[PDB]
Each structure stands twice: as structure tokens, then as C-alpha cells.
């Protein structure tokens, strides 16, 4: 799980993306349970209501 | 007691699938576990488990 | 820690009612269920008991409930037992095998099925004497109207006042200040003597 | 003279601890003997390598073979029972002229017993090698592996 | 309940037998805990019906004797010896010295 | 050495063993062949497991004085490992090992708190 | 993937990485090449998440492309504990719990169990069976120095309940020694040693 | 013994008390039917321990007066408490506040200091030579 | 917050079991176990939104 | 505290048994029918009990090596329970158990300090 510690959710436009993954340089979308790329009209509002404006990595989530 | 690992001419450890042709051999190249080698992946863990499997009965 | 149950009026009533239900148990084809979404307990000696009875004959259920309630208040003072009786809606002079005001009030739950659904439940403070625990029960029965009677009688018995066990032990924090002061004053008296 | 007092008290502590330990051992030697006897396996665990215990005295061929095809299996020979097969060839028996002939087992259990028994009974019959070549047998062996 | 219908091939059953097979009542004991976080000092027990029949004894149990044995064979905090030694230490450190 | 190991593991192993005995006695209700050796595939190896009659605990064919006889597989589909496991069931079944108290008293570890292991919860819910 | 122009390429492309979102969205078009490719994929890797999604996709229209796959898997991994509903471990009885009999084993007809491990006939017969039982289900149980006890004795039996068996008294009553006697010996021997040392010196 | 052997034996001896509810009189069966209570759930030879029963009789007696009551808890988290989910639906009464005491076969640890202290302690004695 | 589809999100309560010796995370959701391999890209892309949307 | 309390159990039992003996002596005056076996109904079960001629303590029909025989009742009025209690009175009456010290030396408890129990309920009722 060490390589995933810098992964933070941050969505451009309405498509949920995952940043901070080093071995996958291209922007990798976020998949759902049925392995569908996540497109959400209110992604920014959801992220703000989850942690706030500032991005949160996986390391901060694990240290909660 | 000192443990050593069988390697080929390129200092790549011989897999277990060749054990039958290593026991019958007499001039096997061996690398001693005392000296650390960073080129072999997981050498420290392998030497650790080699030393640990000695002490089954004791 | 295996501790005894601290017997209390509503607990005695519930246990007597459950025993009477068990000794008149009859098979039935109705499905009776308990569904609790969340159970949260964070206080010590807060025992939780989820007993799932269900008797389809609700008339006999109220009969046994009133009988158990009468046997419970057989030890209370006369004025208190009587006033609690009118508060609940049960009259002692009436035979338990009769429809009372409480049953009439709780018949409004006849249409709904005999299922106990709690979205979220949390156990409050449970002050008990040492060696004993305060036990809370969630009892289901074969009719929601018998359940209505059950919780209303339980609340009425909870309305009484039982003196609480008070904790006199001070909160504990690691006391390095005392040993530090002791060392400092030992040095002080060493200097004074010298 | 504080140093002398400190030395005396620490040496007295050492001697007194020695005597206490001696008397406790004298009274509890039997007790610790049965405690160790009934808890002998608790001294050293058999997972010193971080892996489950393995008895090297009991030999298993599957520990070293990393190739499936090299392993010996029992396969259903169509219309002639069961045979023992591997990438090397079928397990055979001596023929009329000290040749190799595929030996055939009536039941899966008999084939398993013969193949995996401790007795060394390996007789390679390669149907794809030059001295003994059979197109149908070689095709079946290659297909069933 | 028929042993014949308990191992037959479902493809060769008539429609009526298929439905009758589908409309059986099956008893079901299971006391399942999907997720459990049990630490060193806690314990969990499960049962349905006779799933705990072997933990009950037909003969009566003298639980008083069980507690008496649990107290007899148990660690003894020697408060009498400790108090006597503490008193001796205090007397020696204050009066004797 | 023994006192420290016992303090660390004995009571936790006993509680876990009682829990799994209850679980397996619930599981054995209505099944008659659960007390017979079946070759269970654990991904990388096979193990000849049954359910112990007396304790209703998982039981496996043992390898000498070590742990269970884990027949390693050279791929996902290994007929040879399956057949050797069946051979063990028929022949080498006289020596068995049980999870929990017996494994702790024979090998020094219970197997319930080591992963991967055929007694552990993670390897059985995976 | 609304037209079959990419079928030929994706057929070979998705065997390497069957979990790719593009491969699953190609499967979701529900054409024969996609379903057959994933049937061949899942006959060997039926214990992978993309095979759960494949089963969710095909059923109930094209269950025949999953069942076959399952069969192959459960005839190769007969030792898998998850193929023990579709392929019962008993040698003679492999079809023991096929069809409406799937509900005779309450482990097969469980909500926690994934439906990719049952044939479609077992899947449709899973919800229409009657269970006159008496069950306790707890989704989560975090114990912190607690003693939970989940008993359900439910069919009418003898009312009286026997006392729990206490085990056997393994510990033996050995002949002990006085508690103060070790302390007495220690003090006496220390005093005697000191007295002899003082006298001889 | 197998079911066929059971049938053959009980047809050989149809008056044996051991097999009397596997082949009961039609009177008993129709009394049970007309009471809405199957005979095998209350008729005494069925309850007998030594009575021999076939598979069908056993799997039908196992469903005698069985109730259908379920408890479905969610995320339970208790600390320093006791949880007692009874789900009891029969005449049997759960033994409330019945302290279940077992034999605590406690193993007494002894005050044995690790004998690695033996050299160091000797060193302690040695420092008396500093006071000479 | 768990996305049951591309555009649908639902609040859920999950349990996580991590085994770092083999590198796998088992997520109990709705009573069902989902095994995610930490060495798989798709499993990572599915699990990470679940972890990073926790509260 | 637990050790001290379990130690004091014996003295508490002696005192309560003796006081109950005094109250039994006081109660059994002018009533010869209380000295014979009667089927006392406890709301849920019948017990065939009397007062011992020597110790003047409640003495009931014993069930094997256990406590007093409790004829379970299936209803408020259960004729069968009364009939069976009478049957025990007339046939199986040679095995008896007495509250107090015999109760303590046989089953481990005194009968008193236990609620509900036939000794305590009979002392409270009578």
C-alpha cells in the first residue's frame, strides 16, 4: 500500500479522476463497483462535502 | 553453521526444480549468505528462511 | 466479567411475562422478527438482552401481561401501586382476563405485523451496584399491540425512582508530580540538615 | 562513607536475591518441570521462518516441481481404462522382448496408488520419441496434458 | 422426503414433481456473525437447538465446589507477609538506623 | 521462554477455538459427510481437510511432525496435486492436525493469527 | 462498441486484461463474440471480479454463456469450496443440489454468497423457497472486553435446562509450605552469614 | 441398518413395541390427522430412544412444531458489557442471570527472574572489593 | 460513498480487512465480501475512491 | 473481596439456616397438616413438600441427585401436573431433600439467598 499513499481524488469537469499515482503517468479515472468510469454532475460538491476544498491523500485517510 | 545458495555461472540462484541435478553435482557454484549481495532480489529473506528452517526440531 | 443481573421492577415484570408466554407457548404460522440497524454500547455493565418471543393469541398475551403486572405491584405500597395502575390503564379490581383501557388504547397496532424495527439503538448510562449489571431488554411478541402494552408498562415502571449507586473514586492520572515534589523536598531537607 | 554503604546494600541485594531465587527454585522445581513438560511446544514455535512448519523427513515431490507437465497424473484413456501420463510419457511395463508397453489400470484409485506410491516404479514410454513413435498415442498425450 | 427424488436428474422430472420439489419447507439453524473483531479478553458463543448440547451435563453440577476449587488453586496475594515486611522495613529505617 | 509464549497466546487461542468449535458444530448440522476427508483447494496448494467429530474443528492430514500436508500446485489446474491429495486421504490419513488448541500445543502456534494459513479467517473468507 | 467493427480485435485484446473497463463495456453490448470470449475467460478465472460482472451482465438473457463456463471451472477446480453447490464433493452425488433442491442447503441460497457460483436454474429457484427455521444474523460484532452469547434454542423441547458442565479439576492439591517460611529462612541465613563474617573478622 | 432392512424386520415382527409408529394402526394416523397434529410428533413409540425409524420418518419428525422467528441485527459494538440474543420461541426458558462457572485450571507463574541476571548479580557482589 | 454505477452514488457502511503479507483488502459491503488485489490496476482504481470518500 | 465473600458464604448459610429453623418451629404450631406432603403450586410448577419433623425446615421430594421435583405446568390450571405430583407423593417419596445444611452439603447452595426458590418462597408465603 506504500505506492498508493499519495493517491488523492480530484475530478476534472464532471469525471472523477485519481491523481498521485506514480507508475501510471496518464490521468486514471475512478471506477465504480461494476467497473464503470465515474461521471457525476455534482462531483465537486461531493468532494467538498467529504473532506473539503483541500485534497486529501490516502495517507491522511489512513492516519485518521 | 554457515548457509550457502546454489547459483549458476551468472550468479543467478538455481530454482528448486533443478534440485535433483544439483545434489548429484559436485562442483556447484555457491554464494555464502554471510556476505550481503544487493544484485540478487530477496537474498536476505532467502538466507533468513534458510537459517530458520534449520531449527525445526530444536 | 460474569456479573449478576440487578433485579428491578420492570425487569421482574418482563421476565415473569416471558415465563408465562413460554409456559403457554403455542405453535403459529406467523413470522415474527426483530430488525435493528445499529446497536451501540459504550458504557460498562450495560447488559443488553434481545429476546424474541411471539404468541399469535394477543388476547392471552394481554391476559398474561396484566397478570404479571398485578403480581409485580403486589409488593409496592397501596397508594403507589394504585396510582401507577391508573397511570398505565389497568384496574386491580378487574380480572386479568378482561379488556382494559390499556388494551383498548393499544389496539391501534392490530393492522401492523409483529415485527420490531429499530433504525438505531444506543444504551445509556447504567449505574449498578458492584458485582451486578443493569440489564436492558428488547422483547418482541406475536402482536404489535402486545408490544405497545409492553413498552408502555416498561416506561411506567421506569418512571419510579430507585436510588442510584454513586461513584466516589477520583479520576486517575499518572502522578509524577507527587514523586517529583518528594524528591525535591528530600533534596531540600538534605541541604537543611547539611 | 556513602560509597561503602551503597556497595554494601547492592551486594546484600544481590545475595538476598540469590537466596530468594534458590529457595523458590527449590520449592517449585517440580512445578516448573510439569509446566515445561505440558507446554514444551511453547518454547520455540515451529514457524521460525514466518511460514508453516514443514517436516523435511517426509518427502514430497510437489515441493520442487514447478512445471505441471513434468508431474505425473492419471488420465482417462478412451476405451482402455486409465493410464499414468506426463510430459515424459506414459508409465509402461516390460513387453515380450523387454520392450515398453503402456500399462492400463481398471480404476482411478489403482492408477493413483501405482503412480504416487513410495516404490520407484518409473518406466518412461514416450510415444513421440524416435525409437517408439505412435501418432495417435502422441497426439492423445499432447492433448490431455 | 422421497430418497428417489433426492438424487434424481432434474432434467428428467415432470413439471408437477419439479414444482413439488420447489415447494418444500426446510428447517434452518444458523447463528452467523459476518464481521467480528474479538480481542484477547472477549469471547463469543453461538448455538441453535442442540448445537450446544454437549456443554450441558445431565448430572447436577455443584458450582459451589467449582468456585471453592477455583479459589483453592489460585494465586495468593500475601498481604499479611507484605504488611509485616513493610512494618519491619519502616521500623528498621526509622528506629534501628 | 514458555511462560512468555503462554501469556501471549494461550487464552486468546482458547477463546478462538471455542468460537470455531461452535461455528463448526452449527455448520455440521444436517450434513453427514462433513466428517470425511475432502481435498480443499487453497489457491496455491491442496489440503486434505475434514471436520473433527469430537471437537467440530477443522482437521487436516498431517505431514510427519509438522503442519498439514500442503500439496503445492504448479498452476491453477493441477491434476497431479489433486490426485496426490486423494492418495494421502486413502493412505496417509492416520496422522492428523487440528486448528487451535491442538496446533498450539503441538507446533507452538495456533494458526488462527497467521496469514496465509488454512486455519486463519482471511484465507477462508478470500 | 455499438457496432461489431472492434469485435475481432477486442476478442484477442481482452483475454490479456479481462478487467479493463473498455473490455467490460464491450461485453455490455451483449454480442456473441464478447459473451463467448468472456465465457472462455471465465471458465478458468471464475473466481475473479470481472467474472462476477460478466455473470451480472449476461443473465438472464444469455445465461447459457455463463453456466457452461461455470461447469468447466467447477470440473477443473473440484476442490474449490465455492463449486460445492454446483458440483457437490460427493463422488456419486454431484448434481445433489441442482434445480429446486438448491434450497435444501441453506449455504447455497445465501445473500452473502455470490450468484456466479450457481447455475441459472439454481439462481431462479433460490428466491422462491420456504425456510421454516429460526435464525440469528449479525452483520458486525465488535467486542471490547465483552462476553457476547448468541443462543437460539427454538423448537419445543424440555423446559428445564441443565447446568453448564464445568470440566474437570486438572490441578492437584500438592503439599505446600508456609508462606512466611521462605522469608524466615532468607532473613535467618543472612543474619547468620553476617554474624559469622563479623566474628571471624 | 438400512431402510429396506428396517422394513423387512418390522414386517417380520409387526407387533414389536420397537417398531410401532413406523407402522402404526390407521386409527392413530387418522386421530393425528383429525387433530391437526401429526402422529409422529406426539405418539410415544416415536419418542422412544431404541425405536428404529427410516429416513422419511426422521426427516418429518425433525419438522415437528418448528417455529419461524428470526433476529437480524446490524452493526453491533459493545464495550465492557454483555450481549444476550436469545431468539427463543419455545416452552424452554433461558436461564437468566445463571452464572456459568467453569474450572479455572489456572497455572501459577513463579517469581523466577531470568537467570541471565546471574552474572550481573555476581558483578554486584564483586564491587565489595571497591570498599576494601 | 460508494458508486453502484457510473453516475449513482450511495452512502454505505463497510468493513475492511487488510493483509499486507499477501497484499489484499477484503471489503465487506451489504454482507458480501469483495477481494481487491493491491497489485492490480483495476482493483486499485475501484478501491481507492471507496477509501478516499470515507468519513 | 471475592475471596473474602466466598469465605463468608459458609457463616451466612449457617446463620440463615438457623434463623429459618427458628421460624419453622414458630410457624408449625397447631397445624399437623403442614407436616405431611402437599402439592404446593408455585404458579408455574408443583412441588410435593412438607416440614421435617426434626429440623423444622422445608423438605420436598427430590429428583434423583438434583433439587426438588418441579412438575412443569402448561397452563394456569394444569390437572396433569397435580395428578403427577400426587403420584410422586404416593409412590416416589423415599427420596427427599431439605433446605438448609443438607441442601448445602448436597447441591452447594442453602436454598436461601436464592430467588425464586421453593425454600424462600415457602418461607415468605408461610
mmCIF file with all atom_site columns, C-alpha atoms in Angstrom, chain G residues 131-171, chain H residues 41 47 64-93 95 98 100-106:
data_model
loop_
_atom_site.group_PDB
_atom_site.id
_atom_site.type_symbol
_atom_site.label_atom_id
_atom_site.label_alt_id
_atom_site.label_comp_id
_atom_site.label_asym_id
_atom_site.label_entity_id
_atom_site.label_seq_id
_atom_site.pdbx_PDB_ins_code
_atom_site.Cartn_x
_atom_site.Cartn_y
_atom_site.Cartn_z
_atom_site.occupancy
_atom_site.B_iso_or_equiv
_atom_site.pdbx_formal_charge
_atom_site.auth_seq_id
_atom_site.auth_comp_id
_atom_site.auth_asym_id
_atom_site.auth_atom_id
_atom_site.pdbx_PDB_model_num
ATOM 1  C CA . UNK G 1 131 ? -37.435 -21.648 5.170  1.00 0.00 ? 131 UNK G CA 1
ATOM 2  C CA . UNK G 1 132 ? -39.363 -22.551 8.337  1.00 0.00 ? 132 UNK G CA 1
ATOM 3  C CA . UNK G 1 133 ? -36.328 -22.126 10.548 1.00 0.00 ? 133 UNK G CA 1
ATOM 4  C CA . UNK G 1 134 ? -35.114 -19.956 13.414 1.00 0.00 ? 134 UNK G CA 1
ATOM 5  C CA . UNK G 1 135 ? -32.104 -17.790 12.631 1.00 0.00 ? 135 UNK G CA 1
ATOM 6  C CA . UNK G 1 136 ? -29.886 -15.086 14.113 1.00 0.00 ? 136 UNK G CA 1
ATOM 7  C CA . UNK G 1 137 ? -27.896 -12.831 11.772 1.00 0.00 ? 137 UNK G CA 1
ATOM 8  C CA . UNK G 1 138 ? -25.383 -10.225 12.954 1.00 0.00 ? 138 UNK G CA 1
ATOM 9  C CA . UNK G 1 139 ? -23.671 -8.119  10.301 1.00 0.00 ? 139 UNK G CA 1
ATOM 10 C CA . UNK G 1 140 ? -20.938 -6.813  12.619 1.00 0.00 ? 140 UNK G CA 1
ATOM 11 C CA . UNK G 1 141 ? -19.853 -7.529  16.197 1.00 0.00 ? 141 UNK G CA 1
ATOM 12 C CA . UNK G 1 142 ? -17.015 -5.514  17.748 1.00 0.00 ? 142 UNK G CA 1
ATOM 13 C CA . UNK G 1 143 ? -16.226 -6.928  21.196 1.00 0.00 ? 143 UNK G CA 1
ATOM 14 C CA . UNK G 1 144 ? -14.145 -4.830  23.616 1.00 0.00 ? 144 UNK G CA 1
ATOM 15 C CA . UNK G 1 145 ? -13.798 -6.827  26.855 1.00 0.00 ? 145 UNK G CA 1
ATOM 16 C CA . UNK G 1 146 ? -17.321 -8.194  26.425 1.00 0.00 ? 146 UNK G CA 1
ATOM 17 C CA . UNK G 1 147 ? -18.903 -11.654 26.568 1.00 0.00 ? 147 UNK G CA 1
ATOM 18 C CA . UNK G 1 148 ? -21.481 -11.999 23.811 1.00 0.00 ? 148 UNK G CA 1
ATOM 19 C CA . UNK G 1 149 ? -23.671 -15.097 23.671 1.00 0.00 ? 149 UNK G CA 1
ATOM 20 C CA . UNK G 1 150 ? -25.950 -15.708 20.679 1.00 0.00 ? 150 UNK G CA 1
ATOM 21 C CA . UNK G 1 151 ? -28.072 -18.744 21.534 1.00 0.00 ? 151 UNK G CA 1
ATOM 22 C CA . UNK G 1 152 ? -31.280 -19.687 19.704 1.00 0.00 ? 152 UNK G CA 1
ATOM 23 C CA . UNK G 1 153 ? -32.979 -22.805 21.075 1.00 0.00 ? 153 UNK G CA 1
ATOM 24 C CA . UNK G 1 154 ? -36.223 -22.651 19.290 1.00 0.00 ? 154 UNK G CA 1
ATOM 25 C CA . UNK G 1 155 ? -38.076 -25.926 18.683 1.00 0.00 ? 155 UNK G CA 1
ATOM 26 C CA . UNK G 1 156 ? -40.255 -27.020 21.605 1.00 0.00 ? 156 UNK G CA 1
ATOM 27 C CA . UNK G 1 157 ? -38.135 -29.185 23.918 1.00 0.00 ? 157 UNK G CA 1
ATOM 28 C CA . UNK G 1 158 ? -37.806 -29.861 27.647 1.00 0.00 ? 158 UNK G CA 1
ATOM 29 C CA . UNK G 1 159 ? -38.235 -26.591 29.529 1.00 0.00 ? 159 UNK G CA 1
ATOM 30 C CA . UNK G 1 160 ? -35.640 -27.378 32.202 1.00 0.00 ? 160 UNK G CA 1
ATOM 31 C CA . UNK G 1 161 ? -32.060 -26.507 31.219 1.00 0.00 ? 161 UNK G CA 1
ATOM 32 C CA . UNK G 1 162 ? -29.156 -28.374 32.767 1.00 0.00 ? 162 UNK G CA 1
ATOM 33 C CA . UNK G 1 163 ? -26.224 -26.567 34.319 1.00 0.00 ? 163 UNK G CA 1
ATOM 34 C CA . UNK G 1 164 ? -23.195 -25.938 32.124 1.00 0.00 ? 164 UNK G CA 1
ATOM 35 C CA . UNK G 1 165 ? -20.547 -28.625 32.509 1.00 0.00 ? 165 UNK G CA 1
ATOM 36 C CA . UNK G 1 166 ? -17.582 -27.181 34.464 1.00 0.00 ? 166 UNK G CA 1
ATOM 37 C CA . UNK G 1 167 ? -14.888 -29.516 33.115 1.00 0.00 ? 167 UNK G CA 1
ATOM 38 C CA . UNK G 1 168 ? -12.504 -31.470 35.331 1.00 0.00 ? 168 UNK G CA 1
ATOM 39 C CA . UNK G 1 169 ? -10.190 -30.413 38.199 1.00 0.00 ? 169 UNK G CA 1
ATOM 40 C CA . UNK G 1 170 ? -6.844  -30.918 36.478 1.00 0.00 ? 170 UNK G CA 1
ATOM 41 C CA . UNK G 1 171 ? -4.893  -29.045 39.170 1.00 0.00 ? 171 UNK G CA 1
ATOM 42 C CA . UNK H 2 41  ? -44.714 -35.644 16.883 1.00 0.00 ? 41  UNK H CA 1
ATOM 43 C CA . UNK H 2 47  ? -40.268 -40.680 21.090 1.00 0.00 ? 47  UNK H CA 1
ATOM 44 C CA . UNK H 2 64  ? -42.362 -31.208 14.461 1.00 0.00 ? 64  UNK H CA 1
ATOM 45 C CA . UNK H 2 65  ? -43.851 -27.948 15.784 1.00 0.00 ? 65  UNK H CA 1
ATOM 46 C CA . UNK H 2 66  ? -40.910 -25.905 14.498 1.00 0.00 ? 66  UNK H CA 1
ATOM 47 C CA . UNK H 2 67  ? -41.437 -22.150 14.652 1.00 0.00 ? 67  UNK H CA 1
ATOM 48 C CA . UNK H 2 68  ? -40.277 -19.419 12.260 1.00 0.00 ? 68  UNK H CA 1
ATOM 49 C CA . UNK H 2 69  ? -38.752 -16.499 14.170 1.00 0.00 ? 69  UNK H CA 1
ATOM 50 C CA . UNK H 2 70  ? -35.650 -14.568 13.122 1.00 0.00 ? 70  UNK H CA 1
ATOM 51 C CA . UNK H 2 71  ? -33.406 -11.836 14.530 1.00 0.00 ? 71  UNK H CA 1
ATOM 52 C CA . UNK H 2 72  ? -31.452 -9.628  12.115 1.00 0.00 ? 72  UNK H CA 1
ATOM 53 C CA . UNK H 2 73  ? -29.035 -7.354  13.955 1.00 0.00 ? 73  UNK H CA 1
ATOM 54 C CA . UNK H 2 74  ? -26.809 -4.855  12.192 1.00 0.00 ? 74  UNK H CA 1
ATOM 55 C CA . UNK H 2 75  ? -23.507 -3.322  13.291 1.00 0.00 ? 75  UNK H CA 1
ATOM 56 C CA . UNK H 2 76  ? -23.218 -4.178  16.995 1.00 0.00 ? 76  UNK H CA 1
ATOM 57 C CA . UNK H 2 77  ? -20.418 -2.602  19.045 1.00 0.00 ? 77  UNK H CA 1
ATOM 58 C CA . UNK H 2 78  ? -20.383 -3.269  22.799 1.00 0.00 ? 78  UNK H CA 1
ATOM 59 C CA . UNK H 2 79  ? -17.669 -2.400  25.327 1.00 0.00 ? 79  UNK H CA 1
ATOM 60 C CA . UNK H 2 80  ? -17.325 -3.905  28.823 1.00 0.00 ? 80  UNK H CA 1
ATOM 61 C CA . UNK H 2 81  ? -20.873 -5.253  28.513 1.00 0.00 ? 81  UNK H CA 1
ATOM 62 C CA . UNK H 2 82  ? -22.799 -8.465  27.832 1.00 0.00 ? 82  UNK H CA 1
ATOM 63 C CA . UNK H 2 83  ? -24.865 -9.271  24.745 1.00 0.00 ? 83  UNK H CA 1
ATOM 64 C CA . UNK H 2 84  ? -27.511 -11.998 25.051 1.00 0.00 ? 84  UNK H CA 1
ATOM 65 C CA . UNK H 2 85  ? -29.525 -12.539 21.870 1.00 0.00 ? 85  UNK H CA 1
ATOM 66 C CA . UNK H 2 86  ? -31.974 -15.302 22.783 1.00 0.00 ? 86  UNK H CA 1
ATOM 67 C CA . UNK H 2 87  ? -34.396 -15.563 19.820 1.00 0.00 ? 87  UNK H CA 1
ATOM 68 C CA . UNK H 2 88  ? -36.174 -18.211 21.888 1.00 0.00 ? 88  UNK H CA 1
ATOM 69 C CA . UNK H 2 89  ? -39.537 -19.370 20.525 1.00 0.00 ? 89  UNK H CA 1
ATOM 70 C CA . UNK H 2 90  ? -40.487 -22.450 22.555 1.00 0.00 ? 90  UNK H CA 1
ATOM 71 C CA . UNK H 2 91  ? -41.549 -23.586 26.018 1.00 0.00 ? 91  UNK H CA 1
ATOM 72 C CA . UNK H 2 92  ? -37.885 -23.763 27.048 1.00 0.00 ? 92  UNK H CA 1
ATOM 73 C CA . UNK H 2 93  ? -36.949 -20.844 29.300 1.00 0.00 ? 93  UNK H CA 1
ATOM 74 C CA . UNK H 2 95  ? -31.649 -19.318 32.375 1.00 0.00 ? 95  UNK H CA 1
ATOM 75 C CA . UNK H 2 98  ? -27.336 -18.073 35.665 1.00 0.00 ? 98  UNK H CA 1
ATOM 76 C CA . UNK H 2 100 ? -21.861 -20.374 34.344 1.00 0.00 ? 100 UNK H CA 1
ATOM 77 C CA . UNK H 2 101 ? -18.744 -21.240 36.354 1.00 0.00 ? 101 UNK H CA 1
ATOM 78 C CA . UNK H 2 102 ? -16.089 -23.496 34.842 1.00 0.00 ? 102 UNK H CA 1
ATOM 79 C CA . UNK H 2 103 ? -12.975 -24.998 36.405 1.00 0.00 ? 103 UNK H CA 1
ATOM 80 C CA . UNK H 2 104 ? -10.302 -22.306 36.125 1.00 0.00 ? 104 UNK H CA 1
ATOM 81 C CA . UNK H 2 105 ? -7.277  -24.591 35.799 1.00 0.00 ? 105 UNK H CA 1
ATOM 82 C CA . UNK H 2 106 ? -5.030  -21.621 36.478 1.00 0.00 ? 106 UNK H CA 1
#
